[PDB]
Design a protein around this ligand. Structure first.
Ligand SMILES: [Ca+2]
Ligand SMILES: [Ca+2]
Lengths: 37, 49, 49, 37
């Protein structure tokens, strides 16, 4: 994806903006963004 | 060379200025990936790539 | 870019302003008032005790 | 695919022209062309 986009893991084809990480919201399918934050 | 069929055009934004003030998007369906040469057949508008 | 608007003079009322311009996504501004003070200018005449 | 076309790994069936490898863009599904360049 784009530089400003981080994928929800290698098994997912969806990339979310980096600003969505560690915001208290489970944007990913299983909330991988907030894991180990 | 690639094959292009059912090509429709639309303009997202435009603002006539000295800079490249305009964006257009082309939708299409093909049969294989490749590279094409694009052109504008008039003098009103000049492309960039 | 230059913009102008009006907002009510009510303390604690959340005001939302919309900025829309060609070639860019719209923006929403949030403006609020927390405290207003009104001070008249005074000239002394005398004192009493 | 064609002689002048390379695939983005065995797990993916898409094939792209060889001029698109190491071009500075992630032309493949997940940037496989730019890997190890
Ligand atoms: Ca999040
Ligand atoms: Ca490439």
């Amino acid at each position: 994806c784009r530089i400003h986009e981080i994928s929800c893991g290698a098994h997912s084809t969806q990339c979310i903006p980096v600003s969505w990480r560690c915001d208290g919201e489970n944007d990913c399918d299983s909330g991988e963004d907030e894991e180990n934050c | 060379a690639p094959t292009i069929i059912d090509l429709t055009c639309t303009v997202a934004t435009c603002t006539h200025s000295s800079d490249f003030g305009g964006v257009l998007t082309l939708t299409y369906k093909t049969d294989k990936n490749g590279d094409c040469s694009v052109h504008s057949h008039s003098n009103v508008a000049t492309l960039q790539e | 870019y230059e913009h102008s608007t009006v907002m009510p003079n009510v303390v604690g009322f959340p005001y939302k302003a919309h900025i829309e311009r060609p070639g860019y996504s719209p923006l929403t501004l949030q403006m609020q008032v927390v405290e207003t003070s009104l001070e008249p200018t005074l000239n002394l005449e005398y004192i009493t005790c």
